[PDB]
Amino acid sequence: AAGPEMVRGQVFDVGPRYTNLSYIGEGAYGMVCSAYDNLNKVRVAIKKISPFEHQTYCQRTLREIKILLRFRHENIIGINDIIRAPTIEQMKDVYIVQDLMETDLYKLLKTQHLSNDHICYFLYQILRGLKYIHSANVLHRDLKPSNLLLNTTCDLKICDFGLARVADPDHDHTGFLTEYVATRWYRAPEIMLNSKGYTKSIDIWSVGCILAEMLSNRPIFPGKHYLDQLNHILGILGSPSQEDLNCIINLKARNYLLSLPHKNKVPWNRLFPNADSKALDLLDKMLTFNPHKRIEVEQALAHPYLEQYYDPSDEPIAEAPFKFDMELDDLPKEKLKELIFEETARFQPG
Numbered sequence: 021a022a023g024p025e026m027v028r029g030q031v032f033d034v035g036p037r038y039t040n041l042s043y044i045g046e047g048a049y050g051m052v053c054s055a056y057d058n059l060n061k062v063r064v065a066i067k068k069i070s071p072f073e074h075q076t077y078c079q080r081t082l083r084e085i086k087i088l089l090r091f092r093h094e095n096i097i098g099i100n101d102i103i104r105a106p107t108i109e110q111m112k113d114v115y116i117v118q119d120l121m122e123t124d125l126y127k128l129l130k131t132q133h134l135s136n137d138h139i140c141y142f143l144y145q146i147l148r149g150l151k152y153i154h155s156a157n158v159l160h161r162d163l164k165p166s167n168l169l170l171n172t173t174c175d176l177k178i179c180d181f182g183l184a185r186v187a188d189p190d191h192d193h194t195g196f197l198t199e200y201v202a203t204r205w206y207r208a209p210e211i212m213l214n215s216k217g218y219t220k221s222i223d224i225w226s227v228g229c230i231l232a233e234m235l236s237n238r239p240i241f242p243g244k245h246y247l248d249q250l251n252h253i254l255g256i257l258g259s260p261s262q263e264d265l266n267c268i269i270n271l272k273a274r275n276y277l278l279s280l281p282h283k284n285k286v287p288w289n290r291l292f293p294n295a296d297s298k299a300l301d302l303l304d305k306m307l308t309f310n311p312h313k314r315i316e317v318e319q320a321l322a323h324p325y326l327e328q329y330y331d332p333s334d335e336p337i338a339e340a341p342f343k344f345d346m347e348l349d350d351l352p353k354e355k356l357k358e359l360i361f362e363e364t365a366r367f368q369p370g
């Protein structure tokens with residue numbers, strides 16, 4: 021108490037700027053708290069991060085900081101500030117200050133039904149942000165309701181780029197049933213068949229899953245485990261056609277799909293009855309089995325369904341593509357801590 025602040029145990033400083041600390045939750049190796057940007061007189065959001073122990077926790081922390089700091093879009097959360105010790109030796113944790121939000125799509129969907137006007141505007145915002153993210157050659161890779169924060173003005177902001185990668189379509193193939201870290205339910209089908217998740221189409225499939233969940237207040241493909249996820253997807257889209265199967269040259273995946281009993285397509289309007297017809301048509305294009313035929317972000321924005329919002333001159337793209345001077349993951353826990361230290365240097369006086 022005579023120095024750092026304690027919130028339900030554990031320390032949680034902010035220096036002489038953020039006050040009125042109020043628990044806001046947690047999640048994993050990090051504690052969140054609303055407070056008070058005494059400078060801006062607003063209650064910011066502060067996440068307590070301490071990854072220097074786990075090497076991977078350090079890389080997710082770095083690219084999240086790198087990406088967010090270099091990005092600037094109304095539909096992407098930003099980093100207002102970052103609190104850390106003055107020395108690398110003294111730095112145990114790192115605090116990131118971010119515009120506070122009222123809730124997230126996950127929590128919202130848990131109790132409030134969405135109106136079409138609400139669904140349309142949310143989708144438009146998800147896609148408007150994604151076009152900027154993809155324009156920077158970056159893939160979010162973990163798009164799901166819990167990563168979409170909203171405030172009381174219904175404004176939406178994409179967050180959580182801990183698993184984001186710089187696109188790389190040329191090095192995307194891989195063998196059948198290749199492990200993945202991203203949230204199962206919103207995982208594209210090709211992930212379980214022969215994709216590393218290095219193409220932009222991976223993000224669009226996720227958004228499609230979000231669209232569906234917003235239409236029904238329940239996850240469209242809630243696969244219990246890794247392979248069940250694919251089984252869920254196929255129960256609705258039906259068996260892939262000859263063409264779609266041909267794109268898959270990887271034999272193991274192809275033979276798996278072929279060993280399966282044929283099943284027909286489950287109609288969308290039958291899955292979501294009192295749901296806009298134009299929306300379901302966009303949902304169809306998004307949840308396309310073949311990654312190559314899947315609609316692209318800019319294409320989706322120009323869909324009749326989003327006509328009342330579509331305005332390309334008001335849908336910004338990044339000043340320049342993104343790249344991490346490591347790409348391949350592998351990088352020592354120490355160095356990472358050093359890189360994190362310098363990446364957060366701009367917020368330190370002297």
Ligand SMILES: Cn1cnc2c(NCc3ccccc3)nc(NCCO)nc21
Nearest residue numbers: 044045046052065118119120121122123
């Ligand atoms: C960066 N950030 C901005 N607003 C919030 C916020 N706003 C409201 C809030 C409070 C409690 C639960 C969900 C949402 N909650 C969280 N995370 C808490 C873990 O869910 N992070 C935020």
